[PDB]
Amino acid sequence: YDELKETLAKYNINMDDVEKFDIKKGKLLVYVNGEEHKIPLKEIELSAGCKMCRDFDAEMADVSVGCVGSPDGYSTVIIRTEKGEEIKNAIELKEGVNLEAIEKLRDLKLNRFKKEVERRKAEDEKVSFYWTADYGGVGKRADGTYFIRIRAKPAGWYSIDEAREILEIAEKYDGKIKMTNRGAFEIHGISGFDVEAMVLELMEKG
Amino acid sequence: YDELKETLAKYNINMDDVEKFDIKKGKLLVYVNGEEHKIPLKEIELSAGCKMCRDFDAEMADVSVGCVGSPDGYSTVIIRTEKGEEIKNAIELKEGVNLEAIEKLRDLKLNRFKKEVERRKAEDEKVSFYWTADYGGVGKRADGTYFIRIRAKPAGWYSIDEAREILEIAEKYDGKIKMTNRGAFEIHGISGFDVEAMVLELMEKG
Ligand SMILES: Cc1cc2nc3c(=O)[nH]c(=O)nc-3n(C[C@H](O)[C@H](O)[C@H](O)COP(=O)(O)OP(=O)(O)OC[C@H]3O[C@@H](n4cnc5c(N)ncnc54)[C@H](O)[C@@H]3O)c2cc1C
């Protein structure tokens, strides 16, 4: 609040008189005593934790609502659960949302997060690797690194090509091979900084 | 017996009058009428089953006795068990056996066996893979090929290099990878003709 008020003070805008705020096209819009003042987002310092955030569209909500992707005066509605489906009784909904506009904001937020994580890695600052729990098969070892379990293939049969692919990915991330008593490859010693990239690489290979 | 008798008849020897036989340095020695006759073993047909034999020195006996590697009028004595050690009480034994003379015949016999198995392979003749039981970790599959179980390493840890070596040997012999519920690599589909060569290769890699 103090940062936004101080920023408004720079443009000679009294916060106590503002009619409405808005954030559109990467700019903050202020409506006070008549016309709307345009302030670039770059010029306002965001809450620090927002730099560590990955979730643009509230992907876990029953229903998510925003302005991006839909005409002005309308709200974008993303229905995700049967509870969220009840909004169809309350609102006359239309199709035609601009899906690519929403995805662009997903990527910009993720790139902001990647820059902040890289900066913490370079500066020896603390990182909580909270997104490892986004993925199945990830466990935390006693020493603060992670193991990644590749779900056992039926009857423990692996093609030579498949096994070689697993070893190549393990080598790339300095992982160590452990064979479980259910016939799975489990790769140990993965840095929290590498877990997401390695899992996606494994998923890409099937 | 009939083959030896007819062979001797060709050299004008009546087997009934023979005083002693000997096999030394590639020859059949025949002592008859106070004479020594030498017949190259190459001119004599051996019993068919000997071509499929691997064991020159009776390697499973309590004590094995022969003439190779010791001076004329002595017997070579290879003691292998505590039962065999009792011969030390019956015989004043001497050291100095020519071990290479014995090894030379081990390898000649093995090479003869390899030639006959290869001949049978080429002719699609019946081979009994009786020597697969010389090695641990070898099992017979339902379809007449074999699996080779690599004894699980402690806690199922394998170096990337170790796993790659196993896969390379599996590939060479057209083997298929199965991971056991004790953390072992088990290689399936190995021909009886290849089992020994493959096991020795794995043993060579440690
Ligand atoms: C901080 C912030 C950033 C946003 N950024 C974007 C964006 O980048 N892109 C985008 O498309 N939309 C964004 N929105 C959402 C958008 O501004 C609207 O809130 C949304 O479209 C709903 O509009 P509405 O007219 O349907 O809701 P309304 O009927 O106006 O109701 C708004 C609801 O928002 C809730 N609310 C308001 N402020 C907050 C807050 N600080 N914390 C929690 N709840 C709050 C109120 O409780 C209210 O129920 C943002 C909203 C906020 C609060």
Residue numbers in the entry:
A (entry chain D), B (entry chain C): 207 to 412
What text appears in the publication on this structure?
Here, we present snapshots of this coupled system, named coenzyme F420-dependent sulfite reductase (Group I Fsr), obtained from two marine methanogens. Fsr organizes as a homotetramer, harboring an intertwined six-[4Fe–4S] cluster relay characterized by spectroscopy. The wire, spanning 5.4 nm, electronically connects the flavin to the siroheme center. Despite a structural architecture similar to dissimilatory sulfite reductases, Fsr shows a siroheme coordination and a reaction mechanism identical to assimilatory sulfite reductases.
MtFsr was solved by molecular replacement, using MjFsr as a template. Notably, the asymmetric unit of MtFsr contains four tetramers (including 96 [4Fe–4S] clusters), providing insights on its natural flexibility. Fsr is organized as follows: the N-terminal ferredoxin domain (MtFsr residues 1–57 containing two [4Fe‒4S] clusters) is linked to the F420H2-oxidase domain (MtFsr residues 58–336, harboring the flavin and one [4Fe‒4S] cluster), which is connected to the C-terminal sulfite reductase domain (MtFsr residues 339–484, 546–618) that binds the siroheme‒[4Fe‒4S] and has an inserted ferredoxin domain (MtFsr residues 485–545, containing two [4Fe‒4S] clusters). The extended loop 171–189 in Fsr serves as a platform to specifically bind both ferredoxin domains, and the Glu 180 coordinates the [4Fe‒4S] cluster 3 (monodentate, 2.22 Å). In MtFsr, the axial ligand is a single atomic species at all sites of the asymmetric unit, which is in proximity but not covalently bound to the iron (2.9 Å). The anion HS− was modeled in the electron density based on the pH 5.5 in the crystallization solution. This species could be the result of cocrystallizing Fsr with reduced F420, which might have forced the complete reduction of bound SO32−. In MtFsr, the modeled HS− is bound by Arg 423, Lys 460 and Lys 462, and one water molecule is stabilized by Arg 355. MtFsr did not accept thiosulfate as an electron acceptor, which is in agreement with the findings for MjFsr5. In addition, we have shown that MtFsr reduces selenite (SeO32−) in vitro with a relative activity of 20.7 ± 7.5% compared to SO32−.
